Curated annotation (Swiss-Prot):
The gene is cyc1. It comes from Streptomyces coelicolor (strain ATCC BAA-471 / A3(2) / M145). This is Epi-isozizaene synthase. A motif (DDXXD motif) lies at residues 84-88. Mg(2+) 3 binds at residues 225, 229, 233. It catalyses: (2E,6E)-farnesyl diphosphate = (+)-epi-isozizaene + diphosphate. SUPFAM superfamilies: Terpenoid synthases (SSF48576).
């Protein structure tokens, strides 16, 4: 049961949850990876990692992925949560130089991950290990696209560092643009492709129905995170959240902002249902009788199916994960799973 202020009946009724069969092995393998890569202290891994549910989030999303593809994705995803925590702590503690150096190393490791597998910063070496594995599944054209997208993500994190150090809350529209980058919309969208075993040609993945379905899946996920992570973000002096932009720039009360975010999330669902029909019609059109057409049709169908799965995976993750349970913490501003 989800509390009424966060409950989305359409998700519960029309987006049934799915779980990849590799999940039990994935859970342990990513936990071990966090420990062995020294991304979290051993005691925090043992106490918190499984309860954070990072592998459950990916195993409810990339259905049909080969096990080793899912493992690379789950390691990258867990890494990205640890990176969000590092970024937050660098801001809180005023470590502008350490953040700037990490930012530069991530840009370089993204282009040459093999070179960084044994870097002295374990966060950099862990990133490089997951990215090198992701780069082994599809042609180098996909790797170049992943890199282009992630360079843009790193710079969005840098912009968040500057906003928080200056005490600036972005306006609503500025925030919505930024959030497509800090949530890594295009990375999750890129990762659909190794999960279904096919790099999609530009003409296919830029078809308006594919693009719009991909966008709406991510807008839902990011704004639902904003809705559910608002309490811990207020407690932590985080400024990046649609609800915070609405309160700051449109004078909404907390209750009014929650209602507005919820309505925007709900609309993403029914806009997605409409565009999903068009995206699946496009998948049917790709099945032109040829072998390549069958492959592309099947890949698009699998990808759109996972765009749909993201809704339910993200929904349930926010109720299951210890990451958001601010009411349980000794210090609401310092989650117990971060290294402070
Ligand atoms: C902070 C982690 N993340 C990607 C894992 C940003 C890089 C946003 C996110 C939060 C919650 C669910 C899904 C993604
Ligand atoms: Mg965060
Ligand atoms: Mg963040
Ligand atoms: Mg959040």
């Amino acid at each position: 049961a989800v509390p009424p202020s966060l409950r989305l009946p359409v998700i519960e009724a029309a987006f049934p949850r799915q779980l990849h069969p590799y999940w039990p092995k994935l859970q342990e393998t990513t936990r071990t990876w966090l420990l062995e890569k020294r991304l979290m202290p051993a005691d925090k891994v043992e106490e918190y990692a499984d309860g954070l549910c990072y592998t459950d989030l990916m195993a409810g999303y990339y259905l049909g992925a080969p096990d080793e593809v899912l493992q690379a994705i789950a390691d990258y995803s867990a890494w990205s949560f640890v990176w969000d925590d590092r970024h937050d702590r660098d801001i809180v503690h005023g470590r502008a130089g350490a953040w700037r150096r990490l930012r530069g190393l991530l840009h370089t490791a993204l282009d040459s991950p093999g070179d960084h597998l044994h870097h002295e910063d374990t966060l950099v070496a862990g990133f490089a290990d997951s990215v090198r594995r992701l780069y082994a599944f599809l042609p180098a054209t996909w790797n170049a696209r992943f890199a282009r997208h992630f360079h843009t993500v790193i710079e969005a994190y840098d912009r968040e560092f500057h906003n928080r150090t200056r005490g600036i809350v972005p306006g609503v529209e500025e925030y919505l643009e930024l959030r497509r980058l800090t949530f890594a919309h295009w990375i999750w969208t890129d990762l659909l492709e190794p999960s279904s075993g096919c790099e999609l040609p530009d003409a296919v993945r830029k078809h308006p129905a594919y693009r719009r379905a991909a966008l709406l899946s991510q807008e839902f996920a990011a704004w639902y995170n904003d809705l559910c992570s608002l309490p811990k973000e207020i407690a932590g002096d985080e400024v990046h959240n649609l609800g915070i932009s609405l309160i700051t720039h449109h004078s909404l009360t907390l209750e009014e902002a929650i209602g507005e975010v919820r309505r925007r999330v709900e609309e993403c669902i029914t806009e997605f249902l409409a565009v999903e029909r068009d995206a699946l019609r496009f998948a049917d059109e790709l099945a032109d009788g040829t072998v390549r057409g069958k492959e592309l049709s099947g890949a698009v169908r699998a990808n759109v199916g996972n765009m749909r799965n993201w809704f339910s995976s993200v929904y349930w993750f926010h109720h299951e994960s210890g990451r958001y349970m601010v009411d349980s913490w000794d210090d609401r501003s310092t989650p117990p799973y971060v290294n402070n």
